Paper text:
A 3.2 Å spike trimer structure complexed with the related, but mostly non-neutralizing, M8a-6 mAb showed three “up” RBDs but only one well-resolved Fab. The M8a-6 Fab shared a similar RBD epitope and approach angle as M8a-3, interacting with the RBD using all six CDRs plus framework regions FWRH2, FWRL2, and FWRL3. Furthermore, M8a-6 also recognized a similar epitope as C11811 and M8a-3, involving mostly conserved RBD residues. Despite sharing high sequence identity and similar binding epitopes on SARS-CoV-2 RBD with M8a-3, M8a-6 was non-neutralizing against SARS-CoV-2 and only weakly neutralizing against BtKY72, whereas M8a-3 neutralized SARS-CoV-2 D614G with a 0.18 μg/mL IC50. These different neutralization profiles likely result from a weaker interaction of M8a-6 compared with M8a-3 with CoV spikes, as demonstrated by incomplete binding of Fabs in the M8a-6-spike complex cryo-EM structure and the lack of competition of M8a-6 IgG with any of the IgGs with known epitopes. To investigate whether M8a-6 binds more weakly to its RBD epitope than M8a-3, we used surface plasmon resonance (SPR) to examine binding of M8a-3 and M8a-6 compared with C11811 to a set of eight RBDs. Visual inspection of sensorgrams and kinetic and equilibrium constants (when they could be derived by fitting data to a 1:1 binding model) showed weaker RBD binding by M8a-6 than by M8a-3 or C118. Although we could not measure analogous distances in the M8a-6-spike structure because only one Fab was bound, the similar epitope and pose for M8a-3 and M8a-6 suggest that an IgG version of M8a-6 is unlikely to crosslink adjacent RBDs. Thus, the weak binding of M8a-6 to a spike trimer could not be improved by intra-spike crosslinking avidity effects, again rationalizing its lack of neutralizing activity. The class 4 and 1/4 epitopes of M8a-3, M8a-6, M8a-31, M8a-34, and HSW-1 were buried when RBDs adopted the “down” conformation but fully exposed in the “up” RBDs.
Numbering used by the authors:
A (entry chain A): 291 to 620, 636 to 676
B (entry chain H): 1 to 9, 11 to 30, 35 to 59, 62 to 72, 74 to 111, 112A, 112 to 127
C (entry chain C): 28 to 71, 74 to 178, 187 to 290
D (entry chain L): 1 to 29, 36 to 57, 65 to 72, 74 to 80, 83 to 109, 114 to 126
E (entry chain C): 826 to 827, 854 to 873
Write the structure that this text describes.
């Protein structure tokens, strides 16, 4: 059957002597060459420069919380950067963050020493965890810590940052305690002054360059990923591929997910409108999100092979008719390619002289076997 | 309970390729990475690399780059590590490890049963 | 009160259609349906008559205004109008529109204080008196102010699948009391992923410095143009007519 | 990269006595040192993951001490189950390096 | 007197100019 078009005709009719006529043997479908995905420009970038190298950081007890939303966050780019010494993501992988979407994310910027880096993690008990900042056990997020010895350590000593040595009760997860009330460790009530049983809860950090790496200051930013069963305000940047025209390709224009050959079009969309439609509720035009140009979508060419044969008693050569398909845009091509309204038939050579109709083709064109 | 099951007693011929399996159960596979550790009696224990499930990010130790290929299957929660061009030096026991966090640093809170690879 | 003759129709979707009649079923303001017409503030004697009712927000609300002094300043949206539940605010001021979705403890009669600068010969807001405090603030949005700049400003407010969609349209008119007869489709303005269910809404009014005086008569400001129309959207079927350019020329209820 | 060196490979201790296992660090790794125990034909088990905080399940007998570049694994009383192979691991940064191992014996 | 989704429309054998000749 697959040897040659005459053999395909023989197989379709299930005979060995096919008579003069036209026989639709199979369908010619043009497969998509490639796939293209286009998405709008990254706009309103998140202010991650602050959580990277802000001029100052808050103390761990009064940890600063920053709301990040309505922007595009490149968590993968954050992971690639080697400035961060510690990049722990207990909830989910850092690389999946770029693909994933969250309705809101918060950054917790605070300064703790290297030895206290462990205390900020699920499943961990410590003085910083108990009285300064606590993490939920089921919390999904990334803990980012990098060395801040040059920034937050001085020869005289950096005592600006404060941490709470003790408190009446352990701090709840994601609870910020800035209270300066003097702690009471005895039955005698505190009177707001230092006493034998009364000690100030906050303690000044000891930061010096000569101190060990664990004692050396570190700036820690904690990213919290939260879903409220609501559409995601912040998401990772979406991949964009260069647009290709006049080639049947798979296209994804902000979720159209269609297949067709794209063409520049003269129809004028309304500025808010994105993708057009025809009468029969089928997509017919789309606007490129990157550049506001309107692209028509005609589908990939298809038709019927429709072998043109004379009687096998007379000849063994045939002509292949590719209906509604022009061969230039797309038996192998290059052998007396003739194009008519019904299609672009292959294997028969056009003649201006007109005779009686023998094999119908379409639009007044009739094929025949003649010298 | 968290379990990381490995077949063990692997037997291969030099120059071939082996696909060591680390079956995991009792814990969510997607929320954590996967690490492999090689154990030679004369070289002790050495970390091989890290693979992120449902991700294309792969990191190999410089010594074991190319020698070991990390593969992950989301279905059935199985982790694979392919060793190509096996020599006599590759004859060792390989441990799959469950990281405490999907990232770095990590201290390998949990470990697998281990496959004893022999190259003969 | 005042019939809305073929008004309140917005583009249902961002789809482009040319020279076709599209029958869509969506929340619409029914044709020839009376819409309540409110006098927000009336000054006689000079006595100030203040009336800013909190109308229930059911399905969609067709809001229109015919104020040339821009006395109307914004909107309130909240299911309880209390700090217990989150509420939506749309505030228009000189630089930009202020949109804030947060738990708001509103005042009894929210308004905006605005004063006149003799040196600059211009009016700028003095103080903001709308909410006592804001807690659990979630969504904040800023855009170029649209309500500013004898003309009819039609706004349709919808909250479907957690999306607060606002449509706008500005048309100069020659009518005074009633909505002019004639059709103009409402283009989308911005879509908000608010995700809060709301049942009540109220309108912001900017109050001049003279109105804030304790005297019952305010001779420095006039609020006679403070008239806004309100209609309620209902589920309906409409036959929308798209012209060649892509706009809605005519519609059938 | 950072290398872990356990100086002594095979060492002897009697049952019930207090013993200390030494691990050396080439660079100051703060307190990021982990210890594991491996019985013959058994998977390694985490004992003390940072410098002093013991893993879940492990007895109070294992106590991790040390800071800076010197780190010590101490066992208050040596049991028959404690006669195994022990490793020290640094988690300062990638790549990860373990110790040379140390086996307890009588 | 006054569509590609798997459908096709075949041109008539006799074109409208040609039936005019008949
Ligand atoms: C560090 O700050 C500089 C300028 O302040 C800028 O490159 C950026 O905000 C920070 N660096 C990175 C890699 O983000
Ligand atoms: C997107 O970026 C390209 C970069 O050249 C620019 O030409 C185009 O105008 C931008 N479009 C929008 C909508 O920002
Ligand atoms: C082939 O077609 C038929 C088949 O018998 C007959 O006319 C003859 O044998 C051959 N030649 C022509 C011109 O038809
Ligand atoms: C496509 O087909 C039309 C008629 O079907 C023809 O005029 C045109 O030349 C063809 N395209 C090319 C590139 O030849
Ligand atoms: C048919 O006539 C056209 C006239 O333009 C000519 O170009 C073509 O070569 C002719 N073909 C044949 C087969 O005579
Ligand atoms: C006018 O408004 C009233 C509400 O008072 C309503 O009952 C009536 O149906 C509306 N239309 C007409 C034609 O009265
Ligand atoms: C207008 O609102 C913006 C909102 O950010 C504010 O920054 C600005 O000061 C306001 N201006 C006046 C005159 O109220
Ligand atoms: C704040 O709003 C969120 C919105 O979902 C809600 O879940 C939460 O309970 C509210 N209260 C807080 C965070 O104290
Ligand atoms: C509004 O939405 C919240 C979200 O869970 C729901 O709990 C509440 O019952 C809703 N209120 C009404 C009146 O439907
Ligand atoms: C709108 O349509 C009219 C004719 O109906 C046409 O003259 C005009 O150019 C069109 N405007 C645009 C922007 O397409």
């Amino acid at each position: 059957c697959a040897l040659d078009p005459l053999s395909e005709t023989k197989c379709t009719l299930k005979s060995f002597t096919v008579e003069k006529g036209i026989y639709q043997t199979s369908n010619f479908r043009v497969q998509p060459t490639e796939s293209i995905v286009r998405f709008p420009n990254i706009t309103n970038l998140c202010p991650f420069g602050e959580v990277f190298n802000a001029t100052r950081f808050a103390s761990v007890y009064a940890w600063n919380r920053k709301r990040i939303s309505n922007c595009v966050a490149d968590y993968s780019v954050l992971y690639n950067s080697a400035s961060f010494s510690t990049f722990k993501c207990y909830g989910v992988s850092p690389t999946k963050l770029n693909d994933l979407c969250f309705t809101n994310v918060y950054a917790d910027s605070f300064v703790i020493r290297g030895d206290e880096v462990r205390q900020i993690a699920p499943g961990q008990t410590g003085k910083i965890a108990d009285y300064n900042y606590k993490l939920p056990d089921d919390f999904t997020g990334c803990v980012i810590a990098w060395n801040s010895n040059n920034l937050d350590s001085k020869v005289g000593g950096n005592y600006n940052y404060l941490y709470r040595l003790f408190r009446k009760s352990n701090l709840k997860p994601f609870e910020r305690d800035i209270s300066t009330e003097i702690y009471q460790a005895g039955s005698t009530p505190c009177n707001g002054v230092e006493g034998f049983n009364c000690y100030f809860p906050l303690q000044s950090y000891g930061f010096q360059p000569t101190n060990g790496v664990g004692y050396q200051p570190y700036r820690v930013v904690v990213l919290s990923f939260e879903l409220l069963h609501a559409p995601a305000t912040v998401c990772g940047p979406k991949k964009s591929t260069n647009l290709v025209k006049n080639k049947c390709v798979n296209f994804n224009f902000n979720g159209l997910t269609g297949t067709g050959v794209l063409t520049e079009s003269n129809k004028k969309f309304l500025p808010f409108q994105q993708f057009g439609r025809d009468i029969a509720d089928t997509t017919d035009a789309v606007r490129d999100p990157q550049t506001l140009e309107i692209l028509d979508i005609t589908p990939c060419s298809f038709g019927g092979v429709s072998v043109i044969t004379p009687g096998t008693n007379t000849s063994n050569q045939v002509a292949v008719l590719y209906q509604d398909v022009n061969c230039t845009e797309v038996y192998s091509t290059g052998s007396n390619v003739f194009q008519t309204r019904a299609g672009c038939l292959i294997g028969a050579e056009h003649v201006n002289n007109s005779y009686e109709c023998d094999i119908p083709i379409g639009a007044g064109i009739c094929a025949s076997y003649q010298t | 309970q968290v379990q990381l099951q490995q077949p063990g007693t692997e037997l291969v011929m030099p120059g071939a390729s082996v696909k060591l399996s680390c079956k995991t159960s009792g814990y969510t596979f997607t929320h954590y990475w996967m690490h492999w550790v090689k154990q030679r009696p004369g070289e002790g224990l050495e970390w091989i690399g890290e693979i992120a499930p449902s991700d294309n990010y792969v990191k190999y130790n410089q010594k074991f780059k190319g020698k070991s290929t990390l593969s992950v299957d989301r279905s059935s929660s199985t982790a694979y590590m392919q060793l190509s061009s096996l020599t006599s030096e590759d004859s060792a026991v390989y441990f799959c490890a469950r990281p405490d966090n999907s990232g770095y640093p990590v201290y390998f809170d949990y470990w697998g049963q281990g496959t004893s690879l022999t190259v003969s | 009160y005042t019939n809305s003759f073929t008004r309140g129709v917005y583009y249902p979707d961002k789809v482009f259609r040319s020279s076709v009649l599209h029958s869509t079923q969506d929340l619409f303001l029914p044709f020839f349906s009376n819409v309540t017409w409110f006098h927000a503030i009336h000054v006689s004697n000079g006595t100030k008559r203040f009336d800013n009712p909190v109308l229930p927000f059911n399905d969609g609300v067709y809001f229109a205004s015919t104020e040339k002094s821009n006395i109307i300043r914004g909107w309130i949206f909240g299911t309880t109008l209390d700090s217990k539940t989150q509420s939506l605010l749309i505030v228009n001021n000189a630089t930009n529109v202020v949109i804030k979705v947060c738990e708001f403890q509103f005042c009894n009669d929210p308004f905006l204080g605005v004063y006149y600068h003799k040196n600059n010969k211009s009016w700028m807001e003095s103080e903001f008196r709308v909410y006592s405090s804001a807690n659990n603030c979630t969504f904040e949005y800023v855009s170029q102010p649209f309500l500013m700049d004898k003309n009819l400003r039609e706004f349709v407010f919808k909250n479907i699948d957690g999306y607060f969609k606002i449509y706008s349209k500005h048309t100069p008119i020659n009518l005074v009391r009633d909505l002019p007869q004639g059709f103009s489709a409402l283009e989308p303005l911005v879509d908000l992923p608010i995700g809060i269910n709301i049942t009540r809404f109220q309108t912001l009014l900017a109050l001049h410095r003279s109105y804030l005086t304790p005297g019952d008569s305010s001779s420095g400001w006039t609020a006679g143009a403070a008239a806004y129309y309100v209609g309620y959207l209902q589920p309906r079927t409409f036959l929308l007519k798209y012209n060649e350019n892509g706009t809605i020329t005519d519609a059938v209820d | 990269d950072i290398v872990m060196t356990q100086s002594q490979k095979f060492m002897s201790t009697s049952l019930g006595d207090r013993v200390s296992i030494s691990c050396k660090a080439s660079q100051d790794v703060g307190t990021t040192v982990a210890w594991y125990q491996q019985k013959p034909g058994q998977s390694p088990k985490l004992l003390i993951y940072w410098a002093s905080t013991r893993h879940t399940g492990v007895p109070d007998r294992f106590t991790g001490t040390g800071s800076g570049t010197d780190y010590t694994l101490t066992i208050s009383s040596v049991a028959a189950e404690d006669l195994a192979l022990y490793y020290c691991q640094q988690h300062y940064n990638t790549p990860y390096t373990f110790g040379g191992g140390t086996k307890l014996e009588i | 007197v006054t569509k590609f989704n798997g459908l096709t429309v075949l041109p008539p054998l006799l074109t409208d100019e040609m039936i005019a000749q008949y």
